[PDB]
Amino acid sequence: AMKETVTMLNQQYVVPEGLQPYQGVTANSPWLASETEKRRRKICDSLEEAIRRSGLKNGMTISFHHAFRGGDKVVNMVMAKLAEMGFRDLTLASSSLIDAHWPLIEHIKNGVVRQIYTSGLRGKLGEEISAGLMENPVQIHSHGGRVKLIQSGELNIDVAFLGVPCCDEFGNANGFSGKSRCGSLGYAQVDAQYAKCVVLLTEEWVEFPNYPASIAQDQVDLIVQVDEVGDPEKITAGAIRLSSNPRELLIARQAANVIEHSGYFCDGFSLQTGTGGASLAVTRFLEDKMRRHNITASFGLGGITGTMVDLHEKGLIKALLDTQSFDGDAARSLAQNPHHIEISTNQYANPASKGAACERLNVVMLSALEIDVNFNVNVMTGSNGVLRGASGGHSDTAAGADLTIITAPLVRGRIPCVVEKVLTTVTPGASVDVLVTDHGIAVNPARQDLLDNLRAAGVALMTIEQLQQRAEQLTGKPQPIEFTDRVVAVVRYRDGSVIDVIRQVK
Amino acid sequence: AMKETVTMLNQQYVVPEGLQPYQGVTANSPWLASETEKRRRKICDSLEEAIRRSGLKNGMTISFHHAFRGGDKVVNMVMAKLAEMGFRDLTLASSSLIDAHWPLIEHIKNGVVRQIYTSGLRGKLGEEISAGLMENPVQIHSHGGRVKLIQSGELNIDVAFLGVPCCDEFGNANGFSGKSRCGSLGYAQVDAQYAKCVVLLTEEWVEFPNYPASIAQDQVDLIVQVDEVGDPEKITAGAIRLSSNPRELLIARQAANVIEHSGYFCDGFSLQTGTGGASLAVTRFLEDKMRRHNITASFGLGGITGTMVDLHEKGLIKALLDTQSFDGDAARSLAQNPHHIEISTNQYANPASKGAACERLNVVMLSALEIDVNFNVNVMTGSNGVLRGASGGHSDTAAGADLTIITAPLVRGRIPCVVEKVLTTVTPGASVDVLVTDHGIAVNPARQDLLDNLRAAGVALMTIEQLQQRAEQLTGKPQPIEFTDRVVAVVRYRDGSVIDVIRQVK
């Protein structure tokens, strides 16, 4: 009907290339021909069907998110199927690997996976990577560094496998209903937007439209119902209380004093606190100083904890921003409280982001496995050189925040935390402002402002060299670990550049 | 420092290409060198500054959204500035043009704009285009058609000029505070995701973080404060009450009976009603029918009006999905009601969307300038053939819905609505199911299911030929109008194909 007039348009007018004439309502939308198909096209009756429909092939990149924490079931469940279907040479871009992912070892041995990109490696899998399980070095990235690698085209995800506790038929999902109610799906939101194919694995179906749509319908290709995506009763349990380890309460009291006299403890300040140890417990002492002064916080950032929810509920922190809820109290507050807000990892920590909330932070509390006399921080490798930790958002929040505090005891048993040179640099010292330990406080000399402020308030300080010599005094000189020349992991700084390598341990 | 070892990685291992060694925390994030800048980098002190920083050149594509309706001030405001700065050959990709955009005529003559992409063209600007104002034919797209054009890469927005009533310094904007509280920002959300550079023109600053973030901080490059983006008094005004016209009420009653007996009027049906006339007033007779049966709808869709809001608060509609609020009542409901949900156009009507909600519609009420005996529908050109109309989501909801109902009086003064052949096909007859007029109902003969159901329920019917002849009896035979051979606009069907052209009127 229209064939001749399109020809003419192309010949006589300035028009867009490739104009074709109309040929029916369903020509490019065949599912519209059927009123069941257009509603139900995404449903998959089995995980195996999802994988076939997903178009996955040998050599491709696949992904997962880690909000199910230690009780994740999705990585292993999907890996097993891909192994049974005979997939080879895959790239595995889980945002993080926990020790319940030890079954990956056999998959790597059988050639199912040839490349790993991750922000965490622990348990038996870290041990095996350090012994030399793979020819290809693991690429280790910060949480925000992951997003940047994806956007840059280096890490291209072909199929995302995203576990969710509830979903509708169209793919609107969240973490507030179902069994494994994890809360924030902020890690999943990155894959939801950039993966070529997004497969949701849901525990429960929900009436369209599902609200909130943490993951939305226009992001989702395939959906399958499974039994469990995490550990329902562990994931929904409430916050564990602050530690009663008096050495950590000492560290946290000290760190609250640093904040108080830092120059940043004013009305409207923003903070990120940690999930355990002193870096969590600091909140107890801050709450007191905030009530003492007549001040409140503009926002709390991170993976939110119940203790931080608690301060929001008393009016002390005006809003919470949540890329991952760390307990079921946080998760339930994200669902119920309107200023407890879910954000993606792009809005959190990406150095290439147009808007990363971490760059608006006044204070962050970070931990450390080791810190050296250059204030360089190790969070990846144990004292024996073996991969045991997570790069995570450590270097992202440190870079972004105005004031970055490392809380670590001087010594852990026979192992010193302050050392001459850390085994692996994850977070550069140029990013670390204060070290707070149980044997004193050391300020980075690059921060003359802080030195002055803390000196003038009568906070007793030391040099990091003094803290180091004291650590060596209490633990002796530690004999170095036996490495081979073999590179086992590449530590990519958040901007994508390389900051260190991890070698194989004899 | 690391240069030596990265070399050794490139040569001895299988690693990603182009690995560079770490060189500082702010190497690729210079704004981090200033604690004030990492919060404020995006703020512009004027519109000129925002246009400078945006990197806009001649021959580039710019965009605007149309949520401020007839009261829009952004297009004129920005256009004035661009012309005053000497920009040439721009592509204008506003989602719809209203009659207050007549200042665009001078800009086109002076060559500020050389190409238009739009869904609507009305008022003086439509008249001038039809008279042959421009060498290049305007591209007319549906609401979802636009998204697909942007996704296909045919329409590439270089800079998006997005008016908002309020936002924080980081770019989190919504339509619920400030003055021009338009409500849903569904159309802007597509520009926000897809434009190379996104400029927000806000009228009010709010404290970080603005919740909800209809436009999110990781989508915004630049922000400037302006006096007004819309017409505050009119934008925020409540819903205009239903028709008092008994003709329209007659059409509404009959459309409600067609729906009742179609086979689609079941518990949990979805619907989209209109913004006026019978297509609005149908709700009034649907409500009583719904209450009569124990029926409630699963969701309403569209640009929501307050009458739809009202049925939701009554619990007769369980969810509302809102790509554009039409009254200040809908706007205010979007803000306060958790299940009055804001969605984007991609979620609404993109044919190439992974999940477009109009595709889950049982029933859609639409309207018509004309409709012919093939049920093809014209909503772009008036009876004199002049551009005075809008494509909109007309062809989108029609194509996705199970049942599409057109409501129009048989005759408008001297002008028949039912004709042999429409001047312009916008929506194809194959997606048009039923026509309801003040002279009777006619069902597309392609819908044998509909015919059987409406007959069995004793609904009196007519052929569309019976109505066409009756309208020709009431209006005489019309003087076929003097088009020239010049093509003035191209009608793009939602899939990007060309369904019709519009010729210059003599």
PDB file of N, CA and C in Angstrom, chain A residues 323-399:
ATOM      1  N   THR A 323      22.081   0.701  49.690  1.00  0.00           N
ATOM      2  CA  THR A 323      22.444  -0.137  48.539  1.00  0.00           C
ATOM      3  C   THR A 323      22.391  -1.642  48.880  1.00  0.00           C
ATOM      4  N   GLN A 324      22.270  -1.942  50.183  1.00  0.00           N
ATOM      5  CA  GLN A 324      22.234  -3.297  50.718  1.00  0.00           C
ATOM      6  C   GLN A 324      21.831  -3.223  52.168  1.00  0.00           C
ATOM      7  N   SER A 325      20.750  -3.898  52.545  1.00  0.00           N
ATOM      8  CA  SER A 325      20.297  -3.917  53.946  1.00  0.00           C
ATOM      9  C   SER A 325      21.004  -5.063  54.669  1.00  0.00           C
ATOM     10  N   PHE A 326      21.660  -4.798  55.791  1.00  0.00           N
ATOM     11  CA  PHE A 326      22.508  -5.841  56.397  1.00  0.00           C
ATOM     12  C   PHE A 326      21.840  -6.738  57.420  1.00  0.00           C
ATOM     13  N   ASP A 327      20.614  -6.405  57.769  1.00  0.00           N
ATOM     14  CA  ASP A 327      19.827  -7.265  58.635  1.00  0.00           C
ATOM     15  C   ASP A 327      18.369  -7.061  58.273  1.00  0.00           C
ATOM     16  N   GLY A 328      17.491  -7.796  58.945  1.00  0.00           N
ATOM     17  CA  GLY A 328      16.082  -7.810  58.626  1.00  0.00           C
ATOM     18  C   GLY A 328      15.366  -6.598  59.176  1.00  0.00           C
ATOM     19  N   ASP A 329      15.911  -5.981  60.230  1.00  0.00           N
ATOM     20  CA  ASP A 329      15.385  -4.701  60.747  1.00  0.00           C
ATOM     21  C   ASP A 329      15.589  -3.583  59.711  1.00  0.00           C
ATOM     22  N   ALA A 330      16.801  -3.477  59.151  1.00  0.00           N
ATOM     23  CA  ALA A 330      17.096  -2.560  58.045  1.00  0.00           C
ATOM     24  C   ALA A 330      16.170  -2.814  56.848  1.00  0.00           C
ATOM     25  N   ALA A 331      16.105  -4.072  56.414  1.00  0.00           N
ATOM     26  CA  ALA A 331      15.222  -4.491  55.320  1.00  0.00           C
ATOM     27  C   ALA A 331      13.751  -4.092  55.518  1.00  0.00           C
ATOM     28  N   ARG A 332      13.221  -4.259  56.736  1.00  0.00           N
ATOM     29  CA  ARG A 332      11.829  -3.928  57.052  1.00  0.00           C
ATOM     30  C   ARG A 332      11.596  -2.413  57.129  1.00  0.00           C
ATOM     31  N   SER A 333      12.551  -1.688  57.705  1.00  0.00           N
ATOM     32  CA  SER A 333      12.548  -0.231  57.647  1.00  0.00           C
ATOM     33  C   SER A 333      12.660   0.372  56.222  1.00  0.00           C
ATOM     34  N   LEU A 334      13.352  -0.296  55.307  1.00  0.00           N
ATOM     35  CA  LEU A 334      13.432   0.167  53.926  1.00  0.00           C
ATOM     36  C   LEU A 334      12.070   0.095  53.281  1.00  0.00           C
ATOM     37  N   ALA A 335      11.333  -0.972  53.590  1.00  0.00           N
ATOM     38  CA  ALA A 335       9.974  -1.208  53.119  1.00  0.00           C
ATOM     39  C   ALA A 335       8.955  -0.250  53.717  1.00  0.00           C
ATOM     40  N   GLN A 336       9.021  -0.033  55.033  1.00  0.00           N
ATOM     41  CA  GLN A 336       8.030   0.791  55.746  1.00  0.00           C
ATOM     42  C   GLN A 336       8.329   2.302  55.798  1.00  0.00           C
ATOM     43  N   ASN A 337       9.584   2.698  55.994  1.00  0.00           N
ATOM     44  CA  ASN A 337       9.908   4.116  56.210  1.00  0.00           C
ATOM     45  C   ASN A 337      10.228   4.836  54.899  1.00  0.00           C
ATOM     46  N   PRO A 338       9.494   5.928  54.590  1.00  0.00           N
ATOM     47  CA  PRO A 338       9.684   6.546  53.280  1.00  0.00           C
ATOM     48  C   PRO A 338      11.037   7.228  53.065  1.00  0.00           C
ATOM     49  N   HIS A 339      11.696   7.696  54.126  1.00  0.00           N
ATOM     50  CA  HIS A 339      13.028   8.288  53.931  1.00  0.00           C
ATOM     51  C   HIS A 339      14.196   7.301  54.166  1.00  0.00           C
ATOM     52  N   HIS A 340      13.855   6.021  54.288  1.00  0.00           N
ATOM     53  CA  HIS A 340      14.813   4.967  54.134  1.00  0.00           C
ATOM     54  C   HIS A 340      14.704   4.555  52.660  1.00  0.00           C
ATOM     55  N   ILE A 341      15.672   4.999  51.854  1.00  0.00           N
ATOM     56  CA  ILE A 341      15.598   4.948  50.393  1.00  0.00           C
ATOM     57  C   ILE A 341      16.542   3.913  49.757  1.00  0.00           C
ATOM     58  N   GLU A 342      16.045   3.141  48.788  1.00  0.00           N
ATOM     59  CA  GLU A 342      16.883   2.164  48.092  1.00  0.00           C
ATOM     60  C   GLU A 342      17.606   2.869  46.943  1.00  0.00           C
ATOM     61  N   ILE A 343      18.925   2.665  46.850  1.00  0.00           N
ATOM     62  CA  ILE A 343      19.756   3.222  45.753  1.00  0.00           C
ATOM     63  C   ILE A 343      20.591   2.130  45.083  1.00  0.00           C
ATOM     64  N   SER A 344      21.008   2.340  43.833  1.00  0.00           N
ATOM     65  CA  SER A 344      21.825   1.349  43.123  1.00  0.00           C
ATOM     66  C   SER A 344      23.297   1.560  43.422  1.00  0.00           C
ATOM     67  N   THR A 345      24.131   0.614  43.022  1.00  0.00           N
ATOM     68  CA  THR A 345      25.563   0.777  43.194  1.00  0.00           C
ATOM     69  C   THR A 345      26.138   1.930  42.352  1.00  0.00           C
ATOM     70  N   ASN A 346      25.450   2.291  41.272  1.00  0.00           N
ATOM     71  CA  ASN A 346      25.812   3.464  40.505  1.00  0.00           C
ATOM     72  C   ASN A 346      25.590   4.773  41.268  1.00  0.00           C
ATOM     73  N   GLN A 347      24.540   4.812  42.086  1.00  0.00           N
ATOM     74  CA  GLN A 347      24.208   6.009  42.809  1.00  0.00           C
ATOM     75  C   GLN A 347      25.033   6.070  44.082  1.00  0.00           C
ATOM     76  N   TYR A 348      25.733   4.984  44.363  1.00  0.00           N
ATOM     77  CA  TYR A 348      26.488   4.812  45.609  1.00  0.00           C
ATOM     78  C   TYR A 348      27.966   5.104  45.466  1.00  0.00           C
ATOM     79  N   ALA A 349      28.647   4.385  44.562  1.00  0.00           N
ATOM     80  CA  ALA A 349      30.089   4.274  44.637  1.00  0.00           C
ATOM     81  C   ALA A 349      30.872   4.348  43.346  1.00  0.00           C
ATOM     82  N   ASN A 350      30.209   4.403  42.191  1.00  0.00           N
ATOM     83  CA  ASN A 350      30.905   4.395  40.908  1.00  0.00           C
ATOM     84  C   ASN A 350      31.729   5.683  40.691  1.00  0.00           C
ATOM     85  N   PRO A 351      33.054   5.561  40.534  1.00  0.00           N
ATOM     86  CA  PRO A 351      33.827   6.767  40.175  1.00  0.00           C
ATOM     87  C   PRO A 351      33.373   7.466  38.877  1.00  0.00           C
ATOM     88  N   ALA A 352      32.829   6.705  37.932  1.00  0.00           N
ATOM     89  CA  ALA A 352      32.304   7.280  36.688  1.00  0.00           C
ATOM     90  C   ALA A 352      30.835   7.734  36.764  1.00  0.00           C
ATOM     91  N   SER A 353      30.202   7.555  37.932  1.00  0.00           N
ATOM     92  CA  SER A 353      28.795   7.901  38.084  1.00  0.00           C
ATOM     93  C   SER A 353      28.591   9.398  37.853  1.00  0.00           C
ATOM     94  N   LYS A 354      27.413   9.789  37.377  1.00  0.00           N
ATOM     95  CA  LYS A 354      27.104  11.219  37.362  1.00  0.00           C
ATOM     96  C   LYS A 354      26.682  11.686  38.751  1.00  0.00           C
ATOM     97  N   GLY A 355      26.473  10.746  39.670  1.00  0.00           N
ATOM     98  CA  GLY A 355      26.015  11.077  41.017  1.00  0.00           C
ATOM     99  C   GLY A 355      26.185   9.923  41.996  1.00  0.00           C
ATOM    100  N   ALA A 356      27.333   9.869  42.679  1.00  0.00           N
ATOM    101  CA  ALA A 356      27.602   8.849  43.671  1.00  0.00           C
ATOM    102  C   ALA A 356      27.529   9.480  45.054  1.00  0.00           C
ATOM    103  N   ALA A 357      26.589   8.991  45.861  1.00  0.00           N
ATOM    104  CA  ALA A 357      26.317   9.509  47.197  1.00  0.00           C
ATOM    105  C   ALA A 357      27.539   9.471  48.117  1.00  0.00           C
ATOM    106  N   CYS A 358      28.469   8.549  47.838  1.00  0.00           N
ATOM    107  CA  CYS A 358      29.683   8.408  48.659  1.00  0.00           C
ATOM    108  C   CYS A 358      30.612   9.623  48.575  1.00  0.00           C
ATOM    109  N   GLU A 359      30.516  10.356  47.473  1.00  0.00           N
ATOM    110  CA  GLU A 359      31.281  11.582  47.300  1.00  0.00           C
ATOM    111  C   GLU A 359      30.643  12.744  48.064  1.00  0.00           C
ATOM    112  N   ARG A 360      29.554  12.493  48.794  1.00  0.00           N
ATOM    113  CA  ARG A 360      28.868  13.522  49.588  1.00  0.00           C
ATOM    114  C   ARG A 360      28.965  13.218  51.075  1.00  0.00           C
ATOM    115  N   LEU A 361      29.825  12.270  51.409  1.00  0.00           N
ATOM    116  CA  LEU A 361      30.003  11.818  52.759  1.00  0.00           C
ATOM    117  C   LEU A 361      30.919  12.726  53.573  1.00  0.00           C
ATOM    118  N   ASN A 362      30.543  12.969  54.821  1.00  0.00           N
ATOM    119  CA  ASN A 362      31.430  13.663  55.746  1.00  0.00           C
ATOM    120  C   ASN A 362      32.402  12.668  56.379  1.00  0.00           C
ATOM    121  N   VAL A 363      31.857  11.551  56.845  1.00  0.00           N
ATOM    122  CA  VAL A 363      32.618  10.568  57.613  1.00  0.00           C
ATOM    123  C   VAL A 363      32.293   9.156  57.151  1.00  0.00           C
ATOM    124  N   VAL A 364      33.326   8.341  57.046  1.00  0.00           N
ATOM    125  CA  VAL A 364      33.158   6.915  56.896  1.00  0.00           C
ATOM    126  C   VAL A 364      34.068   6.222  57.918  1.00  0.00           C
ATOM    127  N   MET A 365      33.577   5.126  58.457  1.00  0.00           N
ATOM    128  CA  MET A 365      34.343   4.254  59.312  1.00  0.00           C
ATOM    129  C   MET A 365      34.648   2.993  58.530  1.00  0.00           C
ATOM    130  N   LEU A 366      35.933   2.716  58.336  1.00  0.00           N
ATOM    131  CA  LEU A 366      36.369   1.496  57.676  1.00  0.00           C
ATOM    132  C   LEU A 366      37.196   0.612  58.606  1.00  0.00           C
ATOM    133  N   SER A 367      37.200  -0.691  58.368  1.00  0.00           N
ATOM    134  CA  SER A 367      38.112  -1.567  59.093  1.00  0.00           C
ATOM    135  C   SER A 367      39.355  -1.838  58.249  1.00  0.00           C
ATOM    136  N   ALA A 368      40.208  -2.746  58.735  1.00  0.00           N
ATOM    137  CA  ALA A 368      41.437  -3.103  58.054  1.00  0.00           C
ATOM    138  C   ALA A 368      41.944  -4.442  58.567  1.00  0.00           C
ATOM    139  N   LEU A 369      42.456  -5.277  57.662  1.00  0.00           N
ATOM    140  CA  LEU A 369      43.234  -6.446  58.088  1.00  0.00           C
ATOM    141  C   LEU A 369      44.643  -5.994  58.439  1.00  0.00           C
ATOM    142  N   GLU A 370      45.202  -5.105  57.627  1.00  0.00           N
ATOM    143  CA  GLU A 370      46.517  -4.501  57.840  1.00  0.00           C
ATOM    144  C   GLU A 370      46.454  -3.048  57.411  1.00  0.00           C
ATOM    145  N   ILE A 371      47.285  -2.219  58.036  1.00  0.00           N
ATOM    146  CA  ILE A 371      47.550  -0.854  57.545  1.00  0.00           C
ATOM    147  C   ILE A 371      49.061  -0.568  57.649  1.00  0.00           C
ATOM    148  N   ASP A 372      49.677  -0.005  56.615  1.00  0.00           N
ATOM    149  CA  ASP A 372      51.109   0.217  56.717  1.00  0.00           C
ATOM    150  C   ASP A 372      51.489   1.645  57.068  1.00  0.00           C
ATOM    151  N   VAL A 373      52.793   1.927  57.126  1.00  0.00           N
ATOM    152  CA  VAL A 373      53.262   3.241  57.556  1.00  0.00           C
ATOM    153  C   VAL A 373      53.009   4.329  56.515  1.00  0.00           C
ATOM    154  N   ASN A 374      52.614   3.921  55.300  1.00  0.00           N
ATOM    155  CA  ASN A 374      52.045   4.856  54.327  1.00  0.00           C
ATOM    156  C   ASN A 374      50.520   4.965  54.397  1.00  0.00           C
ATOM    157  N   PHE A 375      49.904   4.344  55.406  1.00  0.00           N
ATOM    158  CA  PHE A 375      48.452   4.342  55.582  1.00  0.00           C
ATOM    159  C   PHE A 375      47.684   3.563  54.515  1.00  0.00           C
ATOM    160  N   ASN A 376      48.425   2.878  53.632  1.00  0.00           N
ATOM    161  CA  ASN A 376      47.865   1.874  52.702  1.00  0.00           C
ATOM    162  C   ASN A 376      47.138   0.735  53.438  1.00  0.00           C
ATOM    163  N   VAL A 377      45.966   0.340  52.951  1.00  0.00           N
ATOM    164  CA  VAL A 377      45.132  -0.589  53.718  1.00  0.00           C
ATOM    165  C   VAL A 377      44.951  -1.900  52.961  1.00  0.00           C
ATOM    166  N   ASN A 378      45.212  -3.016  53.644  1.00  0.00           N
ATOM    167  CA  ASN A 378      44.901  -4.362  53.160  1.00  0.00           C
ATOM    168  C   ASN A 378      43.566  -4.873  53.717  1.00  0.00           C
ATOM    169  N   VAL A 379      42.644  -5.196  52.819  1.00  0.00           N
ATOM    170  CA  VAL A 379      41.395  -5.865  53.179  1.00  0.00           C
ATOM    171  C   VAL A 379      41.165  -7.180  52.405  1.00  0.00           C
ATOM    172  N   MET A 380      42.133  -7.560  51.569  1.00  0.00           N
ATOM    173  CA  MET A 380      42.005  -8.714  50.685  1.00  0.00           C
ATOM    174  C   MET A 380      42.693  -9.987  51.200  1.00  0.00           C
ATOM    175  N   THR A 381      43.882  -9.847  51.776  1.00  0.00           N
ATOM    176  CA  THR A 381      44.693 -11.009  52.095  1.00  0.00           C
ATOM    177  C   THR A 381      44.986 -11.137  53.572  1.00  0.00           C
ATOM    178  N   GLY A 382      44.948 -12.388  54.042  1.00  0.00           N
ATOM    179  CA  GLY A 382      45.267 -12.727  55.417  1.00  0.00           C
ATOM    180  C   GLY A 382      46.746 -12.627  55.714  1.00  0.00           C
ATOM    181  N   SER A 383      47.093 -12.855  56.978  1.00  0.00           N
ATOM    182  CA  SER A 383      48.458 -12.653  57.432  1.00  0.00           C
ATOM    183  C   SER A 383      49.380 -13.697  56.814  1.00  0.00           C
ATOM    184  N   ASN A 384      48.769 -14.780  56.337  1.00  0.00           N
ATOM    185  CA  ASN A 384      49.455 -15.870  55.650  1.00  0.00           C
ATOM    186  C   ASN A 384      49.496 -15.717  54.121  1.00  0.00           C
ATOM    187  N   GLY A 385      49.053 -14.564  53.613  1.00  0.00           N
ATOM    188  CA  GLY A 385      49.083 -14.243  52.171  1.00  0.00           C
ATOM    189  C   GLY A 385      47.911 -14.785  51.370  1.00  0.00           C
ATOM    190  N   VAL A 386      47.019 -15.512  52.040  1.00  0.00           N
ATOM    191  CA  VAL A 386      45.883 -16.166  51.377  1.00  0.00           C
ATOM    192  C   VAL A 386      44.686 -15.203  51.244  1.00  0.00           C
ATOM    193  N   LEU A 387      44.032 -15.221  50.070  1.00  0.00           N
ATOM    194  CA  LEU A 387      42.838 -14.419  49.805  1.00  0.00           C
ATOM    195  C   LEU A 387      41.742 -14.774  50.784  1.00  0.00           C
ATOM    196  N   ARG A 388      41.277 -13.804  51.554  1.00  0.00           N
ATOM    197  CA  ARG A 388      40.255 -14.083  52.554  1.00  0.00           C
ATOM    198  C   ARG A 388      39.186 -12.987  52.706  1.00  0.00           C
ATOM    199  N   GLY A 389      39.413 -11.803  52.157  1.00  0.00           N
ATOM    200  CA  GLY A 389      38.473 -10.705  52.386  1.00  0.00           C
ATOM    201  C   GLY A 389      37.794 -10.174  51.154  1.00  0.00           C
ATOM    202  N   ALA A 390      37.310  -8.946  51.251  1.00  0.00           N
ATOM    203  CA  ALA A 390      36.607  -8.286  50.161  1.00  0.00           C
ATOM    204  C   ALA A 390      37.150  -6.877  49.949  1.00  0.00           C
ATOM    205  N   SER A 391      37.379  -6.509  48.700  1.00  0.00           N
ATOM    206  CA  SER A 391      37.689  -5.142  48.389  1.00  0.00           C
ATOM    207  C   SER A 391      36.440  -4.291  48.694  1.00  0.00           C
ATOM    208  N   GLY A 392      35.269  -4.705  48.204  1.00  0.00           N
ATOM    209  CA  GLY A 392      34.010  -4.035  48.534  1.00  0.00           C
ATOM    210  C   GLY A 392      33.971  -2.558  48.181  1.00  0.00           C
ATOM    211  N   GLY A 393      33.308  -1.780  49.026  1.00  0.00           N
ATOM    212  CA  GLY A 393      33.190  -0.343  48.825  1.00  0.00           C
ATOM    213  C   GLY A 393      34.216   0.418  49.623  1.00  0.00           C
ATOM    214  N   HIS A 394      35.179  -0.309  50.202  1.00  0.00           N
ATOM    215  CA  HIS A 394      36.195   0.246  51.094  1.00  0.00           C
ATOM    216  C   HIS A 394      36.921   1.433  50.467  1.00  0.00           C
ATOM    217  N   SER A 395      37.496   1.216  49.285  1.00  0.00           N
ATOM    218  CA  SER A 395      38.263   2.242  48.610  1.00  0.00           C
ATOM    219  C   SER A 395      37.406   3.320  47.939  1.00  0.00           C
ATOM    220  N   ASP A 396      36.112   3.026  47.758  1.00  0.00           N
ATOM    221  CA  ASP A 396      35.156   3.939  47.120  1.00  0.00           C
ATOM    222  C   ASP A 396      34.710   4.971  48.108  1.00  0.00           C
ATOM    223  N   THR A 397      34.287   4.524  49.296  1.00  0.00           N
ATOM    224  CA  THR A 397      33.915   5.460  50.350  1.00  0.00           C
ATOM    225  C   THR A 397      35.113   6.242  50.896  1.00  0.00           C
ATOM    226  N   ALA A 398      36.306   5.634  50.895  1.00  0.00           N
ATOM    227  CA  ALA A 398      37.492   6.312  51.387  1.00  0.00           C
ATOM    228  C   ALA A 398      37.858   7.493  50.484  1.00  0.00           C
ATOM    229  N   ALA A 399      37.887   7.234  49.169  1.00  0.00           N
ATOM    230  CA  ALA A 399      38.055   8.241  48.122  1.00  0.00           C
ATOM    231  C   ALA A 399      36.993   9.333  48.123  1.00  0.00           C
TER     232      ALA A 399
END
